[PDB]
Amino acid sequence: SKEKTSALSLSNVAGVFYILVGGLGLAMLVALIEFCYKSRA
């Protein structure tokens, strides 16, 4: 019967920030390799 009013901690949505930054560096990877190919062609 003793249930609590608990806010979400950062651990609950923790991986969403991880796949945010992983999605950021992937776009950093693509923004490099799209300018390099047009500079070759």
Binding site: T5, V16, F17, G23, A27, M28, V30, A31, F35
Partner: protein
């Protein structure tokens, strides 16, 4: 990151300035949207990942704000 992506890639004219990129990311986060559209593929990635960020957080916010006011009606204010 989105401001850095628009300048580096060739994809002209660039509607993603440091005043504009802070505006496009806000409308995505408040789920309203904005007028400009990222056109480079690396620009569409940085839009799409921020999109999946704001759909988890707000839905976590709305579920947890339902989670308080569900408990607040099951208090059983002891009567006898």
């Amino acid at each position: 990151v989105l401001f850095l992506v628009s300048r580096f890639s060739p994809y002209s004219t660039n509607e993603f300035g440091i005043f504009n990129s802070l505006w496009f990311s806000l409308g995505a986060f408040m789920q309203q949207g904005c007028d400009i559209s990222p056109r480079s593929l690396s620009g569409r990635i940085v839009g799409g990942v921020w999109w999946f960020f704001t759909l988890i957080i707000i839905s976590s916010y709305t579920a947890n704000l339902a989670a308080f006011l569900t408990v607040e009606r099951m208090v059983s204010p002891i009567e006898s």
